[PDB]
Enzyme design. Structure first.
Site, short mmCIF file in Angstrom:
data_model
loop_
_atom_site.label_atom_id
_atom_site.label_comp_id
_atom_site.label_asym_id
_atom_site.label_seq_id
_atom_site.Cartn_x
_atom_site.Cartn_y
_atom_site.Cartn_z
N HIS A 114 -29.46 -5.63 -30.04
CA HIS A 114 -28.94 -6.87 -30.10
C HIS A 114 -28.26 -7.13 -31.54
CE1 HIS A 114 -33.15 -7.82 -30.37
NE2 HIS A 114 -32.74 -8.62 -31.22
N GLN A 137 -21.27 -5.36 -42.50
CA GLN A 137 -20.80 -5.04 -41.17
C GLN A 137 -21.66 -4.47 -40.22
OE1 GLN A 137 -18.31 -1.49 -40.71
NE2 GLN A 137 -17.34 -2.89 -42.05
N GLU A 155 -17.69 -6.15 -36.71
CA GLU A 155 -16.34 -5.24 -36.52
C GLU A 155 -16.14 -4.83 -35.13
OE1 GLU A 155 -16.51 -1.74 -38.67
OE2 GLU A 155 -14.40 -0.91 -37.70
O1 LIG Z 1 -15.44 9.29 -39.03
C1 LIG Z 1 -14.93 8.25 -38.75
C2 LIG Z 1 -14.99 8.05 -37.11
C3 LIG Z 1 -14.55 6.96 -36.37
O2 LIG Z 1 -14.44 6.85 -35.18
C4 LIG Z 1 -13.91 5.56 -37.04
C5 LIG Z 1 -13.61 5.97 -38.34
C6 LIG Z 1 -13.30 4.82 -39.24
C7 LIG Z 1 -13.56 3.45 -38.96
C8 LIG Z 1 -13.10 2.35 -39.99
C9 LIG Z 1 -12.13 2.18 -40.48
C10 LIG Z 1 -11.63 1.22 -41.34
C11 LIG Z 1 -12.81 0.19 -41.68
O3 LIG Z 1 -12.38 -0.65 -42.54
C12 LIG Z 1 -13.97 0.26 -41.24
O4 LIG Z 1 -14.99 -0.57 -41.70
C13 LIG Z 1 -14.03 1.15 -40.02
C14 LIG Z 1 -14.27 7.03 -39.09
O1 LIG Z 2 -34.73 -9.09 -24.14
C1 LIG Z 2 -35.24 -8.42 -25.26
C2 LIG Z 2 -35.30 -7.11 -25.83
C3 LIG Z 2 -35.86 -6.56 -26.58
O2 LIG Z 2 -35.88 -5.18 -26.96
C4 LIG Z 2 -36.49 -7.55 -27.52
C5 LIG Z 2 -36.67 -8.66 -27.56
C6 LIG Z 2 -36.97 -9.89 -28.34
C7 LIG Z 2 -38.07 -9.72 -29.28
C8 LIG Z 2 -37.95 -10.65 -30.60
C9 LIG Z 2 -38.90 -11.49 -30.80
C10 LIG Z 2 -38.93 -12.05 -31.85
C11 LIG Z 2 -37.97 -11.91 -32.50
O3 LIG Z 2 -38.00 -12.98 -33.97
C12 LIG Z 2 -36.74 -11.14 -32.71
O4 LIG Z 2 -35.73 -11.32 -33.63
C13 LIG Z 2 -36.72 -10.57 -31.48
C14 LIG Z 2 -35.98 -9.34 -26.33
ZN LIG Z 3 -16.85 0.08 -39.70
ZN LIG Z 4 -33.82 -9.70 -32.73
#
Ligand SMILES: Oc1cc(O)cc(/C=C/c2ccc(O)c(O)c2)c1
Ligand SMILES: Oc1cc(O)cc(/C=C/c2ccc(O)c(O)c2)c1
Ligand SMILES: [Zn+2]
Ligand SMILES: [Zn+2]
EC number: 4.4.1.5
Lengths: 180, 176
Positions: B119, B26, B92
């Site tokens: 991204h 995730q 997620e």
């Molecule tokens: O210490 C921390 C801080 C927080 O802000 C969030 C969590 C829990 C997130 C979570 C709960 C259940 C899931 O299945 C999962 O992937 C993520 C734990």
């Molecule tokens: O607007 C943005 C912001 C940035 O921080 C990076 C890029 C792109 C670069 C890049 C070039 C080739 C790739 O294969 C790839 O996954 C990403 C574009």
């Molecule tokens: Zn999580």
């Molecule tokens: Zn990229």
């Protein structure tokens, strides 16, 4: 607060046929020091560097990490790119050349103001075991398996401070203490 | 410069046996308004909602989205969670209850100071056809396929302003 299950489903549409071969290929993070990043993701977490690219006018490099068998990586430059960027679930680490040598520079991990991005997450067959190994290797923890209420769930940090959830799919159903 | 290829590789270690079944399951993003987010990821991008989790004491929900066939989701509830959280390349989305009504709140996309995350990226068969559909649906573009040096590579934005790359892997294989 929060939506019902039904209200959430009413906001969902079925997948349009044009989208039928899309896949979620990458998550991109900025890294201060690619040396430390490569050592953490490969040695500690067991990922493989599958591709690297360099953009000299731009002054950046891109590194592609993934749980992939190094034998399957094509040797020909062109084919390797096509293969790497058609893998699911890659991590793209961006290095702006120069960051490693500025003492103050740090990227923001998304978990303090201003919040956005939270983490990446790695499914493992045994959180407790994996975390004893991370401890042995000196990894920094945000949360160890049995801290707080969600048990058998951990968070560690990479060399930039980005959070990595460590989870066991089979425990997610039963995160909380039960029958007790 | 930065690292040479040889150098970069010199920093890599072989997989410890204990890590052999690890997978990148995730990427978590927080979302202001799950209604708009669910609509964007399902209708525009063609993902499937595979699991929703609600935590009323903490006042948040989690929505797991993936490129999965909805006919493979288990019917039974513990099975479905195990399956959903064992899929690779899920998204997620976390909704802290109340953000959808808050006029001043917004999440940061990582691309202005302070930067971090950049991204997510979707691989597609054809960047031009995907983006023409996206334009017809009113999607907001950060970079159109042919803007600038890197042709046939596009960047759009989700309802919170997160950037999403739209790339064609078969065609970076005809570029430098
Ligand atoms: O210490 C921390 C801080 C927080 O802000 C969030 C969590 C829990 C997130 C979570 C709960 C259940 C899931 O299945 C999962 O992937 C993520 C734990
Ligand atoms: O607007 C943005 C912001 C940035 O921080 C990076 C890029 C792109 C670069 C890049 C070039 C080739 C790739 O294969 C790839 O996954 C990403 C574009
Ligand atoms: Zn999580
Ligand atoms: Zn990229």
């Amino acid at each position: 607060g929060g939506l019902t299950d039904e209200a959430a489903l009413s906001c969902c549409s079925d997948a349009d046929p044009s989208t039928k071969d899309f896949l979620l290929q990458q998550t991109m993070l900025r890294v201060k020091d690619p040396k430390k990043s490569l050592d953490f993701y490969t040695r500690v977490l067991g990922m493989t560097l599958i591709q690297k690219c360099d953009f000299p006018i731009m002054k950046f490099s891109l590194y592609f990490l993934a749980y992939e068998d190094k034998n399957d990586i094509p040797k020909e430059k062109d084919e390797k790119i096509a293969w790497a960027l058609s893998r699911k679930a890659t991590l793209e680490l961006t290095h702006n050349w120069g960051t490693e040598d500025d003492e103050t520079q740090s990227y923001h991990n998304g978990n303090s103001d201003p919040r956005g991005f939270g983490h990446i997450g790695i499914a493992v067959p045994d959180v407790y075991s994996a975390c004893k190994r991370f401890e042995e290797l000196g990894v920094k923890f945000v949360k160890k398996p049995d801290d707080g209420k969600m048990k058998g769930l951990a968070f560690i940090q990479d060399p930039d401070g980005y959070w990595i959830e460590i989870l066991n799919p089979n425990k997610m159903a039963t995160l909380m203490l039960e029958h007790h």
